Design a protein around this nucleic acid. Structure first.
Ligand SMILES: [Mg+2]
Ligand SMILES: [Mg+2]
Ligand SMILES: [Mg+2]
Ligand SMILES: [Mg+2]
Ligand SMILES: [Mg+2]
Ligand SMILES: [Mg+2]
Ligand SMILES: [Mg+2]
Ligand SMILES: [Mg+2]
Ligand SMILES: [Mg+2]
Ligand SMILES: [Mg+2]
Ligand SMILES: [Mg+2]
Ligand SMILES: [Mg+2]
Ligand SMILES: [Mg+2]
Ligand SMILES: [Mg+2]
Ligand SMILES: [Mg+2]
Ligand SMILES: [Mg+2]
Ligand SMILES: [Mg+2]
Ligand SMILES: [Mg+2]
Ligand SMILES: [Mg+2]
Ligand SMILES: [Mg+2]
Ligand SMILES: [Mg+2]
Ligand SMILES: [Mg+2]
Ligand SMILES: [Mg+2]
Ligand SMILES: [Mg+2]
Ligand SMILES: [Mg+2]
Ligand SMILES: [Mg+2]
Ligand SMILES: [Mg+2]
Ligand SMILES: [Mg+2]
Ligand SMILES: [Mg+2]
Ligand SMILES: [Mg+2]
Ligand SMILES: [Mg+2]
Ligand SMILES: [Mg+2]
Ligand SMILES: [Mg+2]
Ligand SMILES: [Mg+2]
Ligand SMILES: [Mg+2]
Ligand SMILES: [Zn+2]
Lengths: 47, 95, 68, 62
RNA sequence: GGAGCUGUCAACCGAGCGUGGAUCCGAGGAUUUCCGAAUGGGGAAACCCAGCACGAGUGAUGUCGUGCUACCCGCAUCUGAAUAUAUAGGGUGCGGGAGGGAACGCGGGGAAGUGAAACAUCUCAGUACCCGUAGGAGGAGAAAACAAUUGUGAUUCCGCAAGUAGUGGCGAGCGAACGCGGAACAGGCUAAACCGCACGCAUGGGUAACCGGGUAGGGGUUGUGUGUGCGGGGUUGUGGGAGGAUAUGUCUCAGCGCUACCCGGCUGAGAGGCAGUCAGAAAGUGUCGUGGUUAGCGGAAGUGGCCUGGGAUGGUCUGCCGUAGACGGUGAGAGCCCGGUACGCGAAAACCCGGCACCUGCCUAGUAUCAAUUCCCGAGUAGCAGCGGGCCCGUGGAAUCCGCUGUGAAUCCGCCGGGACCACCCGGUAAGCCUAAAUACUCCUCGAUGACCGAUAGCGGAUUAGUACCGUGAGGGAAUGGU
């Protein structure tokens, strides 16, 4: 929650959780930034 | 909670009929509309220190006046016309 | 008249401050009818101080802040 | 009457079925019989409306 | 709370108040005419007239102010008519009820139009409407349960089973349950046998018992049986309980059951353990919370240049904030001008929730084995029959469940259910009561949302709106926003 609060009110930055990835939010964004704790927790859930 | 004879008598009537009765020592008061002639006679003999011969009362309905938000009825009064004793002190109603 | 200065009056000075303040309203109701009252804010003032005296006399027979 | 003054038993409502199976409303009223009951022996009587199932038991005396 | 204010259609004025804290916001208190369940008696609701007690006023009747006085039910007392026991009724003092509310709940009453291409059975539909009566939810509920040879183990609710089994002038249509997956979990008191004590009825006087049992006497009639109450004992399905028999066992003191002794029980206090606002008993006084609600306040960063214009929030170059780029206002698209937002601070008093005391209550004698003779396990009930209601089941071979009428059992070697019924086997112990949670609803209070409406739309109602107007009445019911 230290970095979640840091990028709330930037225009264009949308924040979601690893278990809340969905097609409408990936395709709206030109760039997808994973936290390294969040990218491993997405790969280890889909093997 | 105690009473007062000045709670019955509200105000005097100021009109060119009531000025014509001041010459004969006859006074016109607006009284509270739930008061009989004996309350009014005990009160005038205790407020002004005078002797009262007779009290004549007259209810009057309120006027109803046209207004753009509808009709509206005014307040309903009770006059009481007080005749003093033959030869007592006149009441100074301050004008 | 402040409420703080009506509380040192004992038990029957309030009954004769109530009595000489209903005469003050009575003389002011005659001056409004005859049109000889310039200060018309004094009708509102005397009605409040009659109302303020009944509050002090009622508290003393309800057991709230008694004392001469 | 149709209401017992001890057990509170009232009428039940049902139907009345004909041969063409047409159904109309009627009442099963209870067998209410009047009694002049006493409380203590030799006492004064009192008119009550009781049913026959409470005279068959010992709910009242006479 | 912090400098203006005396609400608003809706101004024009008049006269005043405020840094000695006003107006305004919140909490508690006082006042609270008259009608209305309306309740002193009356009435055409908002009016009319009193009685009694205590005060005020008058020379004295007049007059006045504050209290109290309906009816019914319940409890506690006094009186006890015809009439004797007595009751009905009456007097007195305490408590309670009545009426209203948008939906939701439970019990009871109960249509029709319509569908059947007509219609009567059936449907619509146990719907509309109606009556009784609640609670913050209610009802239900601790197996007379299902199941079928292994088993599940209170109820309610949602999804399946399933538009299936079936049921139907086998027409139109209607329609389960077994069982499986979940939400949520909780279990507790009484009646009876018998044992003490209190009151009433009947019987008995050395017939006899009883005086806690045994052991000696004494007393010399308060026993024996039964009825109504209050305690103890008892709460079960693998049947349990009372009553026996044998071992085993009792925290202190006082009192008590004719006297002594051995033993045991009862009452009161103390000590110790437990439980508590609860379904399992119930009220209250204190004190303390990192607590909650009913006002609030603080809160970062541009007077930036030039162009356009009445106006910059616009364009165009620049400077910053962001745990704040939600929304709105401001002379046109504003994070940086304002009210605020993110994020933190704030409660005298009242109320709610919780903790600790105070207080209140329960427990401190039984436990274990054997015996299987007796006693008990909820009565005008179950069952049976007659007529009906409802179950998928429309009277059918019709079980289970419920109503009225009639007949009318048994206490465990009992009784009820397992879809007529019988035998066997399995399952459970009806005719007493209470029980949180999951579920249903929003007149009303705060806080957000909309590929919702934007004045013939959205509520009938942005405007005198249930207003004007129409109707005797119940009811009907508009139109009108923008400098
Ligand atoms: Mg008053
Ligand atoms: Mg005359
Ligand atoms: Mg007249
Ligand atoms: Mg005119
Ligand atoms: Mg009757
Ligand atoms: Mg019926
Ligand atoms: Mg029909
Ligand atoms: Mg019967
Ligand atoms: Mg205030
Ligand atoms: Mg207030
Ligand atoms: Mg009345
Ligand atoms: Mg009446
Ligand atoms: Mg008698
Ligand atoms: Mg009610
Ligand atoms: Mg029909
Ligand atoms: Mg028809
Ligand atoms: Mg038809
Ligand atoms: Mg047709
Ligand atoms: Mg309940
Ligand atoms: Mg289940
Ligand atoms: Mg008992
Ligand atoms: Mg502020
Ligand atoms: Mg600011
Ligand atoms: Mg704007
Ligand atoms: Mg904005
Ligand atoms: Mg049937
Ligand atoms: Mg069978
Ligand atoms: Mg039983
Ligand atoms: Mg039972
Ligand atoms: Mg119940
Ligand atoms: Mg519930
Ligand atoms: Mg709202
Ligand atoms: Mg409209
Ligand atoms: Mg338009
Ligand atoms: Mg009319
Ligand atoms: Zn009966």
């Amino acid at each position: 929650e230290a970095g979640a609060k840091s990028v709330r009110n930037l225009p264009g930055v949308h924040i979601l959780a690893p278990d809340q990835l969905n097609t409408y939010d990936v395709l709206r964004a030109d760039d997808v930034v994973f936290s390294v704790e969040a990218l491993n927790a997405y790969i280890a859930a889909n093997t | 909670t105690l009473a007062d004879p000045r709670d019955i008598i509200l105000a005097p009537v100021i009109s060119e009929k009531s000025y014509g009765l001041l010459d004969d020592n006859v006074y016109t008061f607006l009284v509270r509309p739930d008061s009989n002639k004996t309350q009014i006679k005990i009160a005038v003999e205790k407020i002004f220190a005078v002797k009262v011969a007779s009290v004549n009362t007259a209810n009057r309905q309120g006027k109803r006046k046209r207004t753009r938000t509808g009709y509206g009825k005014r307040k309903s009064t009770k006059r009481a016309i007080v005749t003093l004793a033959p030869g007592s002190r006149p009441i100074d109603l301050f004008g | 008249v402040s409420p703080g200065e009506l509380r040192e009056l004992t038990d029957e000075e309030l009954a004769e401050r109530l009595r000489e303040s209903k005469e003050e309203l009575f003389n002011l109701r005659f001056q409004m009818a005859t049109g000889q009252l310039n200060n018309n804010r004094r009708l509102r003032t005397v009605r409040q101080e009659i109302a303020r005296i009944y509050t002090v006399l009622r508290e003393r027979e309800l057991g709230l802040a008694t004392g001469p | 009457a149709a209401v017992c003054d001890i057990c509170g038993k009232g009428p039940g409502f049902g139907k009345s079925v004909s041969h063409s199976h047409r159904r109309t409303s009627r009442r099963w009223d209870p067998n209410i019989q009047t009694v002049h009951a006493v409380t203590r022996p030799g006492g004064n009587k009192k008119r009550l409306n009781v049913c026959t199932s409470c005279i068959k038991a010992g709910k009242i005396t006479r």
